[PDB]
Structures are given as C-alpha cells and as structure tokens.
Amino acid sequence: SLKQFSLRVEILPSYIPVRVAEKILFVGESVQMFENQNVLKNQEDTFAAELHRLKQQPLFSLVDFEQVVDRIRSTVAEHLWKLMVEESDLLGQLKIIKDFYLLGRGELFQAFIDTAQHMLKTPPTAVTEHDVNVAFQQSAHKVLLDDDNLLPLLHLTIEYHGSGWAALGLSYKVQWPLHILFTPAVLEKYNVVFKYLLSVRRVQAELQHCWALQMQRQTDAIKWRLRNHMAFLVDNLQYYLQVDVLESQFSQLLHQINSTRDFESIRLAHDHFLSNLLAQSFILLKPVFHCLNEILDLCHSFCSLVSQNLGPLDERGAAQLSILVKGFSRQSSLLFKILSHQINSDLAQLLLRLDYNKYYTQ
C-alpha cells in the first residue's frame, strides 16, 4: 500500500482536472489504509445512490463531480483526524520528537555530552554503538526524572567504515497511524537538524570548561582569556539564535494542528513547521554553514590548547593562538558582513553583536 497506487496523467481525461482526481486519490488511499489492518457509517449505498443518480444524467457536469468527491473527501478526513489526534494523541508525540531530535531536553543532552565525552571523541568502530546507548541510558537516569516506558522508543545509531561524534544518528520508532505522517524521509530531515544542534551545544559546554580553568588559576593565561572570551561571544549568540526559532516555530506548529479538524491541515502544519525550522538554522545555505562550522572547529583546537596545561604555554601554541585570534577575527567579521528573505530573527540577531559595534568599528 501507499505504492502501486498513483495517478496516470497520460490516461486522465482532459475535461476532468487534476485537482479533483487528487481528491479521488486521497479518499481512495485513506479508505485503503484504514480498510486493512482491521483483523464506517454506511453512506456506501447513499453515495452509490448519489453516483447512481449521477450515472443517469446524460451530460457530464464537472462541478457536480467536484462536489460529490469533496463531500466524500472531507468526511473521510474529518474522521481520520479524530482517530489520530484523540485516540493516538499527536501532541505528545511531537513533544517527544522536539525533546530529543531538536534538543528540547537540556538537562539530559548536556549530561550525555558530559558523561560520554571521551568515547564519542574516540573514532568509530563496531562496538561503539552499544557503548553510547548504555551511556545515554545512564544519562537518562543521571537526570533522574524518569517515568515508565518513554525510553524504548529511542536509541543511538553509530555507523563505522562508511571522531565518533560525526556518525551519531538518532532514530524513533513510530506507530502505525503516524506512519504516513512520519515517513523515513522526514525523520531523515530531522536527523540533520539533530547533528547540527548537538554540535553547537557541545562547543558551548567545553568552552566554559576553559573559562572555569582560566578563572581558578602570568601572561599567556590572560591572552587565552581574551581568546576564550572573544570566542565565547559569538558562540552563545549563535545558539541563542537557535533558541529563538525553536520557541517561535514550534508555537506556530501546535497552533495550526489545533486550528481545524481536517487531516489535511495537520499535514500542512508539519510542512510549514519544517520549512521554517530548516531555514532559520541556515543549513540549506552553503557558505554560511561552510564558515560557521570551522568557527566552532577552530574553537575546538583553541579549547584543547588551554586544556593542555595550567602552566603558561609558549611552546609553539602562542604562534598559532595569535594566528587563531586573527583568523577568528577575520571570519566572524566576514559573517557579520553577511548578516548585515530579510527575516526578523536573522537581521535582529546582528545588533546584539552591533550593540558594541565591536567588529564594525574594527
């Protein structure tokens, strides 16, 4: 099912439009889908009596043919909404997706990065998959808030032979009524957002470990501190831009879910949610994603260098720390020029940093 059933456009009569046949397709796919897996107010004969009467008419009229199929289109979609949103409540399911794919659980995902830091750092190999799941299971009980089940609908998937943080995919187990709403393709698009959001979440925590090291302790500590705090500014600013979209777009999504009792709006609700969620993250645009990542990656190499010693390090690190503070100053001002659809979230994020005019005055 949901396959071997499709429009054939070349055989479609010209006076019959494509839109009405799409409604025909929808009511057919719906009544097929909840027809099987059974192991229904009977307007089957009255709609037959409608279609028997429509057979007796000599002349083809389109607006009557549109009216009768859209009557059967709305009646099947009004039910299939009511079965899905009430018996198999979607609002709880979308909450679990945001909590784990979109990092909505902050206590757990920060503790999982904290507890499993070394073993995700180590390169991938076939036995690393069970290791990160039991630590994620330990992270679930580290943040002791734990109900019953809630946990066997989620696991971690590492892939090896085709830095274990790079191959860290999250996957959810969907039920049958939500299997058309959640195909593998959309959870695949959910997967790229999960890898990006956990990256910037990782950078913020270990940078504050550099701050915490620097404050418990000459010169060359107080040059790292400049380099730490210069990198700290744009790092908390970028995640705060991601804070703004995840609040604003998810409030939009739940609202058009509850807007009407049509199943068609529920599908269009989820399409409007993802298109804005991908856009404000700027991940579909190439050069901004291809420059913000190395901003985090050069900060990883700086944060390793300060983590090397509490003693002052001019053993070839001050050579490239001065390279780093000039290389970071260049690219962060380069993205500041790029930030300066004209979306309110992207354009107003600038004059956070322009409150000091700090990169512009330079």
Binding site: Q208, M215, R225, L233, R353
Partner: protein, 420 residues
C-alpha cells in the same frame, strides 16, 4: 550541582538569614521547612531534600563572639535551617587568628554537607568586608577553600562598606581582605552601604534605621541574582554558564548591581531596560566604560519584543562602553513566582563588569595610604603585632590592589591585548 552558602560574621549572618527567609516565602516552604499546602521550580540546587518535605537549605552559619546568632536561633525559622552546624575582635588579624584555631571543625562542617549532597559546585559567601570578626576569618576561610577544592569555584557577595567613613582600622581591614579576594576569589558581587543608603533616602524617608531596611534591598538583589538558577530556563541553567559572560578576566571579577523598579512595591521591556541603564537604578556609589553587561527580567514579558527591545536600547546607547572585551548585552528572562505579590508585573535586575568600581577600591586605598603614612592606627595590639611584626602583608596587599587598579584602567585603554 548543589550550592552551599558560607554565611559568616554578624552582618553576613544577618543577610544570609534574610536571604533564606525570602527564599522560604518565594518557594513553597513554611517557617518549619515543611512543604506548603497551598503550592515548578528547581529547588534541588539551593535546598536539601529531607524525606518529610523539610526543605532545609545548605546554610553554614559561623559565629565568632556571637550576639546576633542567638537572635537568629530564637526565630520561627530556626527549624527551617536545621543542619546543626553552628560552631562557637574588631580587627582583621584577630578574626584571622581566631579562625585558625577552629579551622578543622568548621572545615569538617563543610565536609559533612559536601558528602551529604549528591554533588557540590560553588561556595557562595555572605562576606562582610572590614566586618570585624567577619573580615579576617572570611579571608582565611577563602584561602582554605580553594586549596581543598581546586576544581571548585567561590562566589563572594561582598557588602563593601562605605558609610561616608565607627572602625578606625577599616581601611587596613578592607585592604587585607581585597588582596585575599583578588587572588583567591573566583567571583565577587559588590554592594555599597552608601549607595543603598542613598537609595533608601530616595525611595523612602528612612535614614536612622539604615542597616535594618537596607537588609531588604540587599536581599532582593541576592534573590533576583539567583532566580534564573532557582527556576528552569533555556540558557544559564547553571551558575558557571552564567558567571562566564560576566567575568572576562579573572582579576576584574567584581560585579555591579541595579534594579529597574527600585519601588517594586504594565511596563514593556524597552521601558525597563532603558530605566535600568540610568544611574539612579544603579546601586553602586579619563574615559570609563563597562566591560560586559547582562540583564535578567522576570514577569509578563512579550517574546517578539525582547529582540526589538535590545534593538531599541542599542539605538538609545544609554550605556557607554569601548572595552577590550567583545561581550555585548543580551536580553535574558526568568520566571516570576506565584503566591507572592506580582506588583510591578515586569521587574528586572542587571549585573555588569564596569570600571568605576576601581574608584571605590581606590577610595579605601587612599584612606589606607593616609592612615599608613600617619601610622595613627597600626593598632599595636599584641595580637596585631605578634601576628604581623613586619606589617608587610599590608604592603603586599597594597601592591596587589594597585595592580588591580592599574588593570582596570588598562582595561579602559585600547590595548588590554598587551600587558595588564
């Protein structure tokens, strides 16, 4: 991790007493520590959990020549603070020498709460600068805690004494405390008795009972500075993640305060930030500039206007800065609590690194410098002289605070990339 607060000295025990009473009223806690029947907060960090809902805070009360501590004990709230951890001069040297003999038992009192908690991150000291018994003992305890807990971090809610300048050895005492705090304090939040007194004259007619009423002002600052930890949120869900933005350089770890409705007994976010940047709301008494500014708002705040509000504050340019530090102001938000009055429905506070606190350090250094040339109060008491025959710890403290003053003005300079 859970926070243990080390309230010490008479004034510090007063403000810790009032701080925990305010958090009793603000959270769902009765004066006996019981969960309130009328009652969504993160009470784990600040309040230990007993089994029958006795929310006893992790307060460590130290008394030395105790008077106000007996008054603390005869209170309705004496059952609320029950970890049973109270263990029995006006000179810094007397307070230090008195702390040295009882250091092991008071440190075992530290150790017991450290073991009893699941975890421990910070030691938040209700310290009194030049506070007689409080100063000296607070500096010695500050010096012990970073050695015993090197990974851990120590905050100091210093009530820096300015009373228009009675203690005649007050600049000497404050001078020694500030050296201990600059090398051995991870963070310091500064407060001023003159600035709180001028605010007392502003908002009310209170002049003679200045201390008792300023306790409430200090306590409002102290609760609102921790509300974003005590209540869950998106960002600054831990102390160290908060303190990172406020302190860019470890020598300048000193933080100013302010509150938008000083008379907190509808206002939009643009209005409250603009009111906050004005100097009347500030509670602290050559170019000069902030290094970094942060703000937290609690109340009926609209979300699409907070970004536009910081846009409007940026257009206003009411706060002036050109530091070495790049940290720009951010609009943060916390949860206003229920059951207590929601008057001034939107209400906020600021914490900032600003170079004008170096002037107030330099004021007690100037008083110390004139007193040090006069030698009018070297005290020459046998405690003071037998503890410091050389009297050179005052000179080491003078050179360390002079480094701090020069570091502040070098942070004002365009080149703090170089040597500060």
């Amino acid at each position: 991790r859970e926070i243990i607060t080390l309230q010490l000295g008479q004034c510090g025990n007063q403000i810790g007493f009032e701080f925990w009473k305010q958090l009793c009223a603000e959270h769902g806690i009765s004066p006996e520590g019981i969960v309130e029947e009328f009652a969504t907060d993160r009470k784990d960090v600040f309040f230990y959990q007993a089994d029958d809902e006795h929310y006893i805070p992790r307060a460590v009360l130290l008394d030395l020549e105790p008077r106000v501590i007996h008054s603390i004990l005869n209170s309705p709230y004496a059952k609320l603070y029950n970890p049973e951890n109270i263990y029995l001069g006006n000179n810094w040297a007397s307070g230090f020498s008195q702390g040295e003999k009882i250091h092991e038992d008071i440190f075992d009192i530290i150790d017991r709460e450290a073991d009893g908690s699941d975890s421990l991150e910070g030691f938040v000291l209700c310290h009194s600068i030049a506070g007689g018994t409080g100063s000296g003992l607070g500096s010695y305890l500050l010096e012990r805690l970073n050695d015993r807990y090197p990974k851990k971090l120590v905050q100091t809610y210093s009530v820096f004494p300015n009373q228009d300048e009675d203690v005649v050895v007050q600049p000497y005492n404050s001078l020694l405390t500030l050296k201990r705090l600059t090398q051995n304090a991870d963070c310091v939040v500064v407060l001023d008795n003159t600035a709180l007194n001028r605010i007392a004259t502003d908002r009310l007619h209170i002049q003679n009972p200045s201390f008792s009423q300023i306790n409430q002002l200090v306590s409002t600052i102290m609760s609102a500075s921790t509300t974003t930890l005590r209540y869950p949120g998106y960002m600054n869900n831990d102390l160290i993640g908060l303190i990172a933005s406020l302190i860019p350089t470890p020598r300048l770890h000193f933080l100013m305060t302010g509150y938008t409705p000083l008379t907190t007994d509808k206002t939009t976010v643009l209005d409250v930030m603009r009111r906050l940047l004005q100097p009347k709301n500030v509670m602290v008494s050559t170019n000069h500039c902030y290094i970094a500014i942060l703000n937290i708002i609690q109340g009926e705040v609209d979300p699409t206007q907070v970004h536009k509000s910081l846009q409007r504050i940026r257009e206003r340019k009411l706060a002036n800065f050109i530091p070495w530090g790049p940290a720009s102001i951010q609009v943060a938000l916390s949860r206003k609590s229920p059951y207590l009055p929601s008057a001034h429905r939107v209400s906020g506070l600021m914490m900032a690194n600003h170079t004008s606190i170096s002037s107030l350090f330099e004021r007690t250094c100037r008083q110390y410098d004139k007193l040090r040339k006069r030698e009018a109060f070297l005290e020459q008491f046998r405690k003071e002289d037998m503890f410091k025959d050389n009297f050179d710890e005052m000179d080491t403290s003078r050179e360390i605070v002079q480094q701090l003053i020069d570091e502040y003005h070098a942070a004002t300079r365009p080149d703090y990339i170089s040597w500060g």
